Write a protein that holds these residues in place. Structure first.
Motif, short mmCIF file in Angstrom:
data_model
loop_
_atom_site.label_atom_id
_atom_site.label_comp_id
_atom_site.label_asym_id
_atom_site.label_seq_id
_atom_site.Cartn_x
_atom_site.Cartn_y
_atom_site.Cartn_z
N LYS B 41 17.53 -5.78 -37.49
CA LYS B 41 18.58 -5.96 -36.48
C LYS B 41 18.37 -7.27 -35.75
CE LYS B 41 20.41 -1.40 -35.42
NZ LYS B 41 19.99 -0.63 -36.60
N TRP B 42 19.45 -7.83 -35.27
CA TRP B 42 19.43 -9.09 -34.49
C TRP B 42 19.93 -8.85 -33.06
CZ3 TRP B 42 20.41 -8.46 -39.59
CH2 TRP B 42 19.65 -9.23 -40.48
N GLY B 43 19.59 -9.75 -32.15
CA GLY B 43 20.05 -9.73 -30.77
C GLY B 43 21.43 -10.35 -30.74
N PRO B 44 21.99 -10.52 -29.55
CA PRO B 44 23.37 -11.00 -29.37
C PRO B 44 23.70 -12.44 -29.79
CG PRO B 44 22.51 -10.00 -27.34
CD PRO B 44 21.35 -10.14 -28.29
N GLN B 45 22.70 -13.24 -30.16
CA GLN B 45 22.94 -14.56 -30.80
C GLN B 45 23.14 -14.40 -32.31
OE1 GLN B 45 20.53 -17.70 -28.13
NE2 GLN B 45 19.25 -16.49 -29.50
N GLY B 46 22.90 -13.21 -32.86
CA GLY B 46 23.06 -12.97 -34.31
C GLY B 46 21.98 -13.59 -35.20
N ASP B 47 22.34 -13.78 -36.47
CA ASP B 47 21.40 -14.21 -37.53
C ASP B 47 21.67 -15.68 -37.83
OD1 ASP B 47 19.92 -14.71 -39.80
OD2 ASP B 47 20.72 -12.97 -40.93
N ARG B 48 20.80 -16.59 -37.39
CA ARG B 48 21.04 -18.05 -37.51
C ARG B 48 20.97 -18.49 -38.97
NH1 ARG B 48 15.77 -21.29 -36.77
NH2 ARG B 48 17.05 -22.74 -35.56
N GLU B 49 20.47 -17.67 -39.89
CA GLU B 49 20.35 -18.06 -41.32
C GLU B 49 21.53 -17.55 -42.15
OE1 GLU B 49 16.56 -17.75 -43.24
OE2 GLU B 49 15.83 -19.34 -41.87
N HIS B 50 22.34 -16.63 -41.65
CA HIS B 50 23.37 -15.98 -42.49
C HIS B 50 24.53 -16.95 -42.68
CE1 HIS B 50 26.17 -12.99 -44.06
NE2 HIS B 50 25.10 -12.28 -44.37
N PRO B 51 25.05 -17.14 -43.91
CA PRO B 51 26.20 -18.02 -44.11
C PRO B 51 27.44 -17.41 -43.45
CG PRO B 51 25.72 -16.80 -46.14
CD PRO B 51 24.58 -16.55 -45.17
N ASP B 52 28.43 -18.25 -43.18
CA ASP B 52 29.76 -17.81 -42.69
C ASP B 52 30.57 -17.42 -43.92
OD1 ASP B 52 32.38 -17.54 -41.74
OD2 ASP B 52 32.10 -19.05 -40.18
N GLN B 53 30.88 -16.13 -44.09
CA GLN B 53 31.68 -15.59 -45.23
C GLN B 53 33.08 -15.20 -44.76
OE1 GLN B 53 27.86 -13.41 -46.63
NE2 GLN B 53 29.28 -13.28 -48.36
N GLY B 54 33.53 -15.75 -43.63
CA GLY B 54 34.86 -15.46 -43.07
C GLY B 54 34.74 -14.73 -41.73
N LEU B 55 33.79 -15.15 -40.90
CA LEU B 55 33.54 -14.53 -39.57
C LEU B 55 34.78 -14.62 -38.69
CD1 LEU B 55 30.00 -16.02 -39.16
CD2 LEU B 55 30.60 -13.59 -39.45
N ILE B 56 34.95 -13.64 -37.80
CA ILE B 56 36.07 -13.68 -36.82
C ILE B 56 35.82 -14.83 -35.82
CG2 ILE B 56 36.73 -11.24 -37.06
CD1 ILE B 56 35.34 -10.85 -34.28
N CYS B 57 34.57 -15.27 -35.65
CA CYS B 57 34.26 -16.46 -34.82
C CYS B 57 33.37 -17.44 -35.60
CB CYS B 57 33.63 -16.04 -33.49
SG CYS B 57 33.32 -17.45 -32.40
N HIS B 58 33.92 -18.60 -35.97
CA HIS B 58 33.22 -19.61 -36.80
C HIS B 58 32.25 -20.40 -35.91
CE1 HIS B 58 35.81 -18.56 -40.16
NE2 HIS B 58 36.92 -18.99 -39.53
N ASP B 59 32.33 -20.26 -34.58
CA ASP B 59 31.46 -21.00 -33.62
C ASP B 59 30.27 -20.14 -33.17
OD1 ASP B 59 33.09 -23.12 -33.84
OD2 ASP B 59 34.20 -22.72 -31.99
N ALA B 60 29.98 -19.04 -33.85
CA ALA B 60 28.85 -18.14 -33.52
C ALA B 60 28.29 -17.57 -34.82
CB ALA B 60 29.26 -17.05 -32.56
N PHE B 61 27.02 -17.23 -34.84
CA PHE B 61 26.39 -16.68 -36.06
C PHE B 61 26.95 -15.28 -36.35
CE2 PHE B 61 22.89 -19.62 -34.58
CZ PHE B 61 23.17 -20.59 -35.52
N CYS B 62 26.81 -14.89 -37.61
CA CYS B 62 27.00 -13.50 -38.07
C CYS B 62 26.13 -12.57 -37.22
CB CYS B 62 26.62 -13.39 -39.55
SG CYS B 62 26.98 -11.74 -40.19
N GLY B 63 26.75 -11.58 -36.56
CA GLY B 63 26.05 -10.59 -35.73
C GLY B 63 25.93 -11.03 -34.28
N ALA B 64 26.55 -12.15 -33.87
CA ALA B 64 26.63 -12.56 -32.45
C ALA B 64 27.66 -11.71 -31.73
CB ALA B 64 27.00 -14.01 -32.31
N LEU B 65 27.53 -11.64 -30.42
CA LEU B 65 28.57 -11.12 -29.53
C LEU B 65 29.58 -12.25 -29.26
CD1 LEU B 65 29.57 -8.72 -27.80
CD2 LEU B 65 28.17 -9.70 -25.96
N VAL B 66 30.86 -11.92 -29.41
CA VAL B 66 31.98 -12.86 -29.11
C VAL B 66 33.01 -12.07 -28.28
CG1 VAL B 66 31.47 -14.19 -31.21
CG2 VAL B 66 33.26 -12.40 -31.26
#
Ligand SMILES: N#Cc1cccc(O)c1O
Ligand SMILES: N#Cc1cccc(O)c1O
Ligand SMILES: [Ca+2]
Ligand SMILES: [Ca+2]
Ligand SMILES: [Ca+2]
Ligand SMILES: [Ca+2]
Lengths: 121, 121, 121, 121
Positions: B41-66
């Motif tokens: 599990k990750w904290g609210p900044q998400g996973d800094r290594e995960h690629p963007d595969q179509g995130l709802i927010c392109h300005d935050a990591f996968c698993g971030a709070l937006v």
């Protein structure tokens, strides 16, 4: 308010300009990436998986942000604190510290950016 | 203020009681552990290594709070916002959302605990 | 926040930059000396011995500080309001006005110094 | 925050729960009607027309609200203080007092309703 950086490799921590007085309500927001040794970095809650081999704060993960208020024991900060009041009989300057085992800070890297302010009470 | 849980598997997001008005200064603190699929599990900044595969927010990591504010795009929150003012013409109800790819929320787990308050201005 | 002077002789009142929105907590402090006509001066609670001869606010003394929020009726301010919330469905720009009889502002003098700010909520 | 009354006839004044510390920002709002002897009453700025016959505070009118912070001299409060920082780095308990001549409090009447809070800093 106070804004600054806490380095993961700084075993003494960073004193802030905030003097916590009895009854103060404070907010803290911490951000960024740090490591206790591995190439992976963690946020301010640290690494959930890592065993406790003698951390300065047993109530938080390895690589978490913690603090001292004056000459207190360590207190977990993690991502931060929302309109938080300290326990009775805790007062003095806030010091921010990376949670690791004493003597093992030399292989640590990265830092957290931290904001602290006093709130309306 | 508003306090509550933002489930990682909640694709529609968590609507708060907060209406962001022009000139408002807000503080958000987010805490906790969530996953976009893995055991880790990750904290609210998400996973800094995960690629963007179509995130709802392109300005935050996968698993971030937006969040969205009224008719806004997604805005990163991560660990929180300290005495923050929205961009010009951004206003309305705040909705908090876990940052993942649309259609992929079903395997998500855990949640963030979030506090939102309006600050003195 | 907003700071300015409210002249006693200003029948239209002083438009402030403060928009009261549902749920807002506001603080007003008012100070100074003004007259509705006589050579004497009164503070922001006005003259408690003067009869009401058609005041814009029947709930405050002549020479008191009062306000409107958008197109609300007049609301007594007096020396000020501490962490105050408006009645339901009252919203819009705060106008500060000296409490006098319409058409009798011409012989007024002096002014109150007023601070308004939004509080943490 | 502290909410109380200051009785005009109380020579010793009202100790509040508020400890003013260095860096504190405070708001005070004072309201009401009180007398130093006459039938007439005055608000918290007191009687602008009255001479100083030995007041405890020599830079506020007779019948004004004034305060002490720890070991400070008397400080004028009047209708109140908006996001105010104490000059001269004074600190300690706030005591509120009606401004009258020592030994002449016996014939006073009325009270001021006072609210004090600490503000965001
Ligand atoms: N990002 C992403 C993603 C990709 C594949 C499956 C998932 O459940 C995901 O969350
Ligand atoms: N100022 C004054 C004063 C002078 C005489 C008697 C009083 O009661 C007073 O309050
Ligand atoms: Ca280490
Ligand atoms: Ca997923
Ligand atoms: Ca007039
Ligand atoms: Ca007296």
């Amino acid at each position: 308010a106070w804004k600054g950086e806490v380095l993961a490799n700084n075993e003494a921590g960073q004193v802030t300009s905030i003097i916590y007085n009895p009854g103060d309500v404070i907010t803290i927001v911490a951000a960024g990436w740090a490591s206790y040794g591995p190439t992976q970095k963690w946020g301010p809650q640290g690494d959930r998986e890592h065993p406790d081999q003698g951390l300065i704060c047993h109530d938080a993960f390895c690589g978490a942000l913690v603090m001292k208020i004056g000459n207190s024991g360590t207190i977990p900060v993690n991502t931060g604190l929302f309109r938080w009041v300290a326990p009775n009989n805790v007062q003095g300057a806030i010091t921010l510290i990376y949670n690791d085992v004493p003597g093992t800070y030399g292989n640590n890297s990265g830092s957290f950016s931290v904001n602290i302010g006093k709130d309306q009470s």
